[PDB]
Symmetry: C2
Subunit: 396 residues, 2 copies
């Protein structure tokens, strides 16, 4: 049965990680990571999360299965973060949330739900986007098309090109937007651009799908959701795949949500029943520990305040490294304008380095980024900044 | 997009649970549950699990993502439980295990893997089987066919009918077997029947898929794996979807495994790379907490000994209720032979009650089972046994 199977394409990212491990050079620096690291180069468990886990250890009296859609408190806290307290979507009971195994799990549940219950055939994603978006949608039998996004000259959002690209999208296609902290570019629409996009998507009949894995990392929790909320104000229907992996540092516990929105309570409940059927046929019901930690924190004033401050500290450290990177590049004689780095949001930015500059940085200097030139600024520290920038200057 | 969607069929099981909650009668008894309960009617967190969770709380310093296939120690412990220490499959590196979100998650990963990488079109499952098997395989675009299994007269395995039914299976079809504690019947092949089935399946070219969610609940850890091991001795290839939900009481933490076996190390590694691609496109990587608890227990002599004893205590309480059920039915004047209950394995048995007897038990007596007449003997206690049996006698 298995003798003819072709090996999966080797994953460029994990191949890089292996090379990094083996590399025996002392001054080595990994900017290819896809998670937060702190100033000591660690990805710690948050304090608020440890306090919540101690409380669960003391108070849980069963591990009996959750419902298919997971912990109710978790779903309510999620909708409030997405749409805001007092949102009409919430008051009008127009949204239903399934807790899922990560944002990736939420994207797959959305994809299976759409493939099996609607006429959707195609999802539009930005060029560039996260490479796993394609695998997930394709696995559900959906085609993925790309729309233009990045102006490589001013290192900004090429808005006219985006709009002109999406002209090719037909009514009933899905269009995927990153809620904030676009991955890999760190370039997000302004609120006015989000509003223009919300109106255009309504007029063209696009189903918006928001991928919202970095809420809190661009400007703050409420601000980072303004784009989504501009869409929700204008559309009867949308889907949000959100993640708590990064903003709670809960990556391996698989804590995300798929939120379905429809015109009214009757319609969303009927459609959500098929989303629950899609989950039942996949992993049945979601993992409790990470989501229970989130609900425990979000629903307790003291814990939520500690966590909100931890998230602010990560966001601020990221901004500090963006600034220190640009200053140090200037000081080490780069000459080029890297000021676009200060404006970009979240952990990631296209450095503007070519795939060959990236390869050279790795081979000659032991500095690792991914071939697209994406760097994770949270991999930078005050200690490794000078060597990192010296190397980058050497390959420019 | 969502206005025309048809509601999913209401799930008969969850509808029963709701009715049970609402029911305000005092003497009510739920035998429709699908999880273990102890003598107080609770589904507690195991002591070994609490001790392991305290150790994780004290020692974990990151929640950084696991690999796609999860914790390596977990995979090794899993293969040893499945195949036995010293197994040639392990020595010859013929098996690869992905930690998955439950046994259900492992079945879906197996199904996606087979749909996308082999010619498999069809999976054979027993009549009766677990209803979610069909949803999972169908979601991956595989047909499900049923083979005969239950002799309703002697309440045993109808072996001739099973063999004759499977004659219709073609070479390259998958045949699913429950490793022990068949759900819903509690009827398992004897070792000699397992051996006959292993030989027949090799001769006919069937790919065996074992669903092994109750290891330890029929006779013990090693004994309950003898059927699987008889197959593994005879086949170059098989798949096992196993679960720790019940034997560790870790239901909601989603802890299972998909184990792929091929003729040799090169072939299994090549095929496993596509199983990992199937996982990456689904939920990316598995939830750490439940699996880390399992690996922590299985790899520590003191914890493993406590857990093994807890599992033995559950298995023994289940046997005690099977015996007490038969005795009490006799004492309350049932008259019919219910001795088949003593021989059946695990939490579940077909009571032999009809769908209308089940409905009557619920409406008139507040005793809940599922329409097939399946009862969970772990829902029985010394305290509720007399009333339960009085009611059953009343509807015979």
């Amino acid at each position: 049965m298995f003798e003819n199977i072709t090996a999966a394409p080797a994953d460029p990212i994990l191949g890089l990680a292996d090379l990094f491990r083996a590399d025996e050079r002392p001054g080595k620096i990994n900017l290819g990571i896809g998670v937060y690291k702190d100033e000591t180069g660690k990805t710690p468990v948050l304090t608020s999360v440890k306090k919540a886990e101690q409380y669960l250890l003391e108070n849980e009296t069963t591990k009996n299965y959750l419902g298919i859609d997971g912990i109710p408190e978790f779903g309510r806290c999620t909708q409030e973060l997405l749409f805001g307290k007092g949102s009409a979507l919430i008051n009008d009971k127009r949204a239903r949330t399934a807790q899922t195994p990560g944002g990736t799990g939420a994207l797959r549940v959305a994809a299976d739900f759409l493939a099996k219950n609607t006429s959707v055939k195609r999802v539009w994603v930005s060029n560039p986007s996260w490479p796993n978006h394609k695998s997930v949608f394709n696995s559900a039998g959906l085609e993925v098309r790309e729309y233009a996004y990045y102006d490589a000259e001013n290192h900004t959002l090429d808005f006219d090109a985006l709009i002109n690209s999406l002209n090719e999208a037909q009514a009933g296609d899905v269009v995927l937007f990153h809620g904030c902290c676009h991955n890999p570019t760190g370039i997000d629409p302004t609120l006015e651009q989000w509003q223009t996009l919300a109106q255009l998507s309504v007029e063209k009949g696009w189903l918006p799908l928001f991928d919202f894995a970095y809420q809190g990392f661009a400007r703050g929790l409420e601000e980072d959701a303004e784009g989504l909320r501009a869409f929700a104000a204008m559309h009867k229907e949308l889907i949000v795949a959100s993640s708590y992996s990064k903003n709670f540092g809960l990556y391996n516990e698989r804590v995300g949500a798929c939120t379905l929105v429809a015109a009214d309570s009757e319609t969303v409940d009927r459609a959500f029943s098929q989303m629950k059927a899609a989950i039942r046929a996949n992993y049945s019901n979601p993992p409790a520990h990470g989501a229970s930690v989130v609900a425990t924190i979000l629903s307790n004033d003291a814990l939520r305040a500690i966590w909100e401050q931890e998230l602010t500290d990560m966001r601020q450290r990221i901004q500090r490294m963006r600034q220190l990177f640009v200053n140090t590049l200037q000081e080490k004689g780069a000459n080029r304008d890297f000021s676009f780095i200060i404006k970009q949001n979240g952990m990631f930015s296209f450095s503007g380095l070519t795939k060959e500059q990236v390869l050279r940085l790795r081979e000659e200097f032991g500095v690792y980024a991914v071939a697209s030139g994406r760097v994770n600024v949270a991999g930078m520290t005050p200690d490794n900044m000078a060597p990192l920038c010296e190397a980058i200057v050497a390959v420019l």
